[PDB]
Design a protein around this ligand. Structure first.
Ligand code: HEM
Ligand code: HEM
Lengths: 451, 446
């Protein structure tokens, strides 16, 4: 009945607890101490963090709870607009864009993106083939190059050419700095010395809008048709309203794909490779499948679907470190959670995904061990125990995209290289709005298999 | 390219090879002679027995192969109906019951069955505590009493009371005799047919009555029948009808009781034949089972006992084969072209003796092989089948077997007083026939 709550800071309540460079990991430690639910109070803000499958399965009941915009999402909305990830379910543009975009993100639609994904994947493999002896790989840096370029190519047929650069394309620099400002605002009084941050923030917003608006205008003027999401959005019509997306909303969706997809997906690849080099038996099993299945110089769509164990590796990496680590809900009406926590209409909940994925009542006592064999049969996994892609109609629309991209790329990596954890890397998880293993490095020795 | 085939009998092709009292063991000997794959032809039937992890890992690719009803399963279907084990994947009632029953067979659902499992396990322990000096234990007989009563209690809150009886419950007599007819038909009568239909009626009558009684009573138990009466398939939104619920109950009794008791019997056999392994398992039992009654959490802590059971399943998987068909034209192992609909048999005991996987000591009983599941290659160990058609009762069987074996090792020292010579009797399952031991109580109260 009485809800646990972490330490307070006078008038600031719990807010200073988030003034730390690893806030998700701090919240996990608080959940370890306080249990399946704790209250978190700030000036003008109350929320409750959920960690157990017992309570989260109720929070995922869409008749009782709807997606809430967390403070992080509200700040991202300043440049993602009413894109899919930062719009309320009741906003006309959410259901409109959802209906238009769902078929172009289906498993069947990955057949059309496959060639462009292979284009960037081959660039990554060639970069590593061309490294000299005793040079090493900066894993998240290269994974982020790959996912950004892949979303750029599949999203709107634009080549960021990240593998030709040390300093990223100006759009990426402004996007990363915009996301950084959004995160920093969470841990922040509105002192006059933040005026520089604000002026830079508006400059970065303009950089993103200008490039994306320009590409949209260029595409409309040309009339050319590609296999990208931009073509689908220029030609799609919502069956419900009968309307297409307008040019401004299309821009917000493109920005959203880049934000929502690039860092989550590169983090997944980075964590997956981290767990593989730390668990050599798993690596060997995953590399055997890669060599057996990927028998052609270029992987096909059907071959990627056959990489079952690689997919199991990715799910277990998502279990331990889900790279979009939380989502927020509000109670649609007065309701009682778990039979002991009464909630009033509008009350907010946070789903702490890494804690959910460590619920021993679901996964057993070995929750911290990396064992892809947990995912041999996904249907056996209990409902709402595994939520790396969110929930319900507000779940990740790019789930099939992210997993196809990650399975293809990891499969090619395991096919073409042996990996060495040459520094005995100590896991250090850097936190933005997503999670990544900072400073993770490996050496790759080519198996000399041509492309 | 050219596929080996054992000796033929003119028009009967290979069929007379199955007219033997130990057909699985005969097929294992053929696999020893012919290798990882051989064709087996009969009048109107062609199948291919696979024995190597190399080929079986491909056969377990669900995009290329689906479960086939073997001739044995087709005959069992005459009384298991479209229960889970004897239904095709494309049958509406398979996916429906699969979705409904999966949560009631989860590791989490074992917490609710644990008390009833302990009920029967304590009865087994008390039977052995009450034996007189120089009396002995008929191991598979008592293990079958236990597994039969446990599924009856957990399945539909019914007490077969096998530990109060010499002659089994009338349902069991008809079930065993029906399974006997199903097996005999493979190696093969008006009396047999009339008896077969009588046994079907006995099974249907009792199960339909228990279902009707439960609906009339309205009572709610912690059993599978309650879940099936109240469950709805999330996909179709439909519940199982009463006829299918009956077939599921019959299936649980068939699919679970003899496989699981065979596992316990083989496990105890290997333990008494390997005293160092028994001692290690007994040491774990005494360290973990510190209360008069094991808890659910304690059973999960019996790690080495779990390895013992897995190694027993490796050597003698008690459901020794399953059947697959090719969904489309495909090439197996890069040299064996298969046409759509072509059938495969997975010879599990041979798979589990693949020296390229387990090393040269494949016949030795070493639970330590199972220290890390990640070290085992994909699809090398398949005692519970494969994919979405894998054993739904796997967590049930292993929880029951781990609980019971743990209590046995806590409460008794065992003697292989006859120096028992392994003799594996074959039905549709496997068991060490005539396996007997003496148990000396450690005098630990319950
Ligand atoms: C492994 C990689 C990814 C993970 C773990 C992930 C995770 C998530 C999660 C947890 C949500 C729910 C957020 C909430 O409820 O507030 C979400 C939503 C979303 N994601 Fe992802 N995501 C990934 C990749 C991608 C990719 C590649 C794309 C597109 C190119 C994408 C686009 C979106 C969109 C548009 C939404 C909002 C959908 C809606 O609410 O209508 N994501 N994602
Ligand atoms: C150690 C004991 C057991 C072993 C070795 C075993 C083995 C197997 C195997 C190999 C299959 C696949 C059959 C095929 O592909 O044709 C299977 C399926 C099945 N088993 Fe078990 N089993 C055991 C115990 C149990 C128990 C205790 C139950 C239930 C109480 C059970 C119920 C089932 C069912 C319903 C299926 C069919 C699942 C489906 O296709 O949806 N089994 N079992």
């Amino acid at each position: 009945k009485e809800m646990p709550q972490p330490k307070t800071f006078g008038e600031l309540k719990n807010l200073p607890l988030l003034n730390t460079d690893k806030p998700v990991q701090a919240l996990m430690k608080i959940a370890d101490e306080l249990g399946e639910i704790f209250k978190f109070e700030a000036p003008g803000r109350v929320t409750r963090y959920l960690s157990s499958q017992r309570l989260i399965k109720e929070a995922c009941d869409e008749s009782r709870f709807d997606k809430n915009l967390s403070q992080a999402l509200k700040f991202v909305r300043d440049f993602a607009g009413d894109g899919l990830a930062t719009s309320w379910t009741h906003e006309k543009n959410w259901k409109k864009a959802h209906n238009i975009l769902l078929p172009s993100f289906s498993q069947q639609a990955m057949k059309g993106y496959h060639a462009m994904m292979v284009d960037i994947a081959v660039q990554l493999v060639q970069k590593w083939e061309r490294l000299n002896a005793d040079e090493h790989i900066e894993v998240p840096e290269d994974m982020t190059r790959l996912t950004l370029d892949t979303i750029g190519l599949c999203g709107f047929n634009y080549r960021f050419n990240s593998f030709y650069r040390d300093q990223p394309h100006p759009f990426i620099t402004s996007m990363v700095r915009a996301l950084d400002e959004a995160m920093n605002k969470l841990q922040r009084p509105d002192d006059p010395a933040y005026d520089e941050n604000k002026r830079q923030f508006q400059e970065d917003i303009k950089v993103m809008n200008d490039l994306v608006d320009k590409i949209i205008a260029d595409r409309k003027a040309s009339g050319e048709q590609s296999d990208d999401l931009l073509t689908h959005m220029l030609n799609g019509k919502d069956p419900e309203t009968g309307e297409p997306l307008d040019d401004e909303n299309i821009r917000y969706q493109i920005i959203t794909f880049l934000i929502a997809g690039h860092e989550t997906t590169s983090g997944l690849l980075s964590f997956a490779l981290y767990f593989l080099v730390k668990n050599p038996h798993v690596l060997q099993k995953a590399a055997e499948e890669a060599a057996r299945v990927l028998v052609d110089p270029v992987p096909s769509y059907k071959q990627v679907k056959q990489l079952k164990y690689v997919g199991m590796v990715l799910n277990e990496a998502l279990r331990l470190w889900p790279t979009a680590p939380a989502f927020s809900l509000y109670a649609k009406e007065d309701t009682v959670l778990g039979g002991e926590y009464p909630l009033e209409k509008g009350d907010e909940l946070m789903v702490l995904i890494p804690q959910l994925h460590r619920d021993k009542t679901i996964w057993g006592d070995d929750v911290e061990e990396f064992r892809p064999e947990r995912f041999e049969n996904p249907s056996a996994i209990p409902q709402h125990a595994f939520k790396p892609f969110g929930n319900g109609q507000r779940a990740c629309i790019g789930q099939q995209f992210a997993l196809h991209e990650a399975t293809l790329v990891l499969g090619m990596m395991l096919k073409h290289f042996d990996f060495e954890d040459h520094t005995n890397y100590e896991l250090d998880i850097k936190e933005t709005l997503t999670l990544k293993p900072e400073g993770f490095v490996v050496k790759a020795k080519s198996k000399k298999i041509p492309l």
